[PDB]
């Protein structure tokens, strides 16, 4: 849910990294002004349609 350069048709990018949303270098732990992509879903049987 967080990645630039919208995918070209029929390509797959399995590349987990640390998003650089901000203006500072970011290595390892995201912390402030830095995020991590690939958020999960969650699923329960009582969920609405």
């Amino acid at each position: 849910l967080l990645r630039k350069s919208k995918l070209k048709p029929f390509e797959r990018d399995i590349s987990t990294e640390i998003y650089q949303a901000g203006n500072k270098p970011c290595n390892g732990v995201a912390g402030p002004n830095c995020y991590s992509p690939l958020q999960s879903y969650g699923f329960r049987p009582t969920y609405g349609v």
Binding site: L1, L2, A21, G22, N23, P32, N33, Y35, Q39, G42, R44, T46, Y47, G48, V49
Partner: protein, 596 residues
Amino acid sequence: STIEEQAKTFLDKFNHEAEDLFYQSSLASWNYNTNITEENVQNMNNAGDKWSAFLKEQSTLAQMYPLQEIQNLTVKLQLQALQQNGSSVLSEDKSKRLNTILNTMSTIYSTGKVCNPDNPQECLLLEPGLNEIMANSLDYNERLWAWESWRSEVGKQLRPLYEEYVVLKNEMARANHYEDYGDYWRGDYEVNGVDGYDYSRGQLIEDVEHTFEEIKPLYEHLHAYVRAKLMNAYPSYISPIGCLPAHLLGDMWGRFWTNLYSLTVPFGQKPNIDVTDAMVDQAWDAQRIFKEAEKFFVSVGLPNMTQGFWENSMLTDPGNVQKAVCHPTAWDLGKGDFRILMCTKVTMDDFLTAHHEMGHIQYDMAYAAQPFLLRNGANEGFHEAVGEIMSLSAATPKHLKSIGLLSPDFQEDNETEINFLLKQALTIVGTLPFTYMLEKWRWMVFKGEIPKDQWMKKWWEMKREIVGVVEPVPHDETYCDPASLFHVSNDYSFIRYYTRTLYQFQFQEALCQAAKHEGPLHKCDISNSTEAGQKLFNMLRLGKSEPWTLALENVVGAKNMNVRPLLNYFEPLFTWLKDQNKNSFVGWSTDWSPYA
């Protein structure tokens, strides 16, 4: 790269992060609220603690991105909502102390001991009991005894804590950028950054006092009428001219004057409109009435709700094998989950409360498209007005006859309309002066215009004048008279009921104008027009996306709250009451002191 994009990224991550935790906490609370057991309490406690910790961590994180840098208004609203809730700007030994004070107050309110006239066998509680006694008991001595005893129990017990509690609350209000607790509470009705629609926190008091001064005459006429009715009901206790005893009227606190209908019924020889008798003939049940309410909602032009509502609802008493707190609530657990918890007993008031709760359920379904921080509706008076207008427009004789419960022979007569209007006014207009006076007293206490040594006297002074009632037993600075109420000891705002009524009637009028219907609006039958449904839905799906003034203009075409629709509704009762008080003075004398 800019501040706005960073804020947008933070918000779009925060929404998806918080939805799961909110759903878990709500589900745990719902599971406890029908299967009461200690493990469910532990689950609720830990889930709520986790949710609060996550919320406070996010609030601390969101301190960056200064508000004058962000231009988008929706981002500003979301950031303000995130920053306000969960803030813990206070020194140590005060937050935990305040929590202890609050929970001790809640526990002491939930456990009241009068123990009868020194009878060790029974100690009455606020369950069916002394409140049930005040509901219907024609005995001056017993009513006075209970009335004084309850306040003596929750008087000096809770009086000293209130001073330090309000001191701490005012200290917290000073700590953050505000004026006082009254200003903090009034800050909800605020609009900024938009011209023509900006609403400040100072105009609310002016509007409230203007509306009350416009309302006054009808209330005073009804007060004269009910004084006369009590005079031929209660002899030798009501002064010819003056105030009224507090314990005699209505409920324990006198908020709702509903129980006086039997003693104050005018020309009530005709059978009551209530149709609870005919329900057993068709063997009605909860499913039937809920389906009928769903059919009405669909006929208005709104969708019916999902099968999950029918699957996971609790619309029947579970029996003695389960421990459930029976009270009508409309839970919206999120992620497309909606369910109502309420017991039913096949009665007319149950039929009305079904519509009342279904209105809230539909409103919750309406705004489920806005982001998480704006999902909650507009100014908190809307969420009750929308649920109350549909109950208002569902008890009319026309709708009952169309449904079939009413026999197709009961024609409408002047006296039936008078009885219905008086029954409505006994609960609709009666509570306005009480709410206004209580909120005004709390505002003055919060501001500090009333010194502590001047408490307990200026409050009763307000009661002897604004409402027109007098204490039967003199009270001194040892008691806290405005402390026996549920909302005072639980730290809840009380103005939400003053703006609930006016708004509601306005909506009704506008809706009853969309569907062409002549005659008095007190008998309106909005059940088939699709234009009114569109008018409601064009504002329902908004939440906190636009200022409430814009929504009000959208629904009715005005710019703020107005009182004309209420008087338009109650005009026939006003005329009949004016024609009735041909030989009785209207008003009261504050100088009367029956206690002496």
